[PDB]
């Protein structure tokens, strides 16, 4: 059986963007993507101040955009919901704090699914590794593929145990 595996990206404050990038691009680690991904976020936040209100953002629309563009601020649910739509795939965050999965793009009928693992502080990408020398890891799964979600949940359990 192929094994769900974490690949550890740099914890440089941008690990959310770096992890998302890694999975949606099919397994490419490029830390330099982060500034561009943040600017894409700011572009989308500024474009809908009705939705991205002061209530949601905890500050002005403009303030949020400047904030997210920094190299030291952490992406979260707002950023993931945005990236899900932009990349048109489901972004499943597996939360090892209490062992659950938050599924962004849950109800948009994307055909694709990707997974990140999250401990409350760090994000890393997950991928499926194959025991066959010739078959490279896969980071994009079918939305039909519910078994990968189950394996992720177990990996969350194991990761929780190991961390403690």
């Amino acid at each position: 059986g192929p094994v769900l595996t974490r690949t550890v990206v740099p914890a440089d404050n941008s690990a959310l963007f770096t992890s998302v990038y890694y999975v949606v691009e099919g397994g490419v680690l490029n830390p330099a993507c982060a500034p561009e991904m943040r600017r894409l976020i700011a572009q989308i936040v500024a474009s809908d101040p009705d939705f991205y209100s002061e209530a949601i953002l905890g500050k002005t629309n403009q303030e949020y955009c400047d904030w997210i563009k920094r190299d030291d601020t952490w992406g979260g649910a707002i950023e993931i919901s945005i990236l899900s739509k932009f990349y048109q795939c489901e972004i499943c965050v597996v939360d090892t704090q209490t062992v659950r999965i938050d599924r962004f793009g849950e109800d948009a009928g994307y055909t694709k699914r990707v997974l990140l693992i999250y401990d409350g502080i760090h994000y890393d990408p997950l991928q499926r590794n194959f025991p066959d020398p010739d078959t490279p890891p896969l980071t994009i799964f079918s939305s039909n593929d519910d078994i990968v979600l189950v394996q992720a949940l177990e990996l969350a359990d194991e990761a929780r145990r190991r961390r403690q």
Binding site: D95, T98, R100, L153
Partner: peptide, 11 residues
């Protein structure tokens, strides 16, 4: 009999 179920929601 009687069994267990786990949700992706952590339950």
């Amino acid at each position: 009999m009687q069994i267990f179920v786990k949700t992706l929601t952590g339950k």
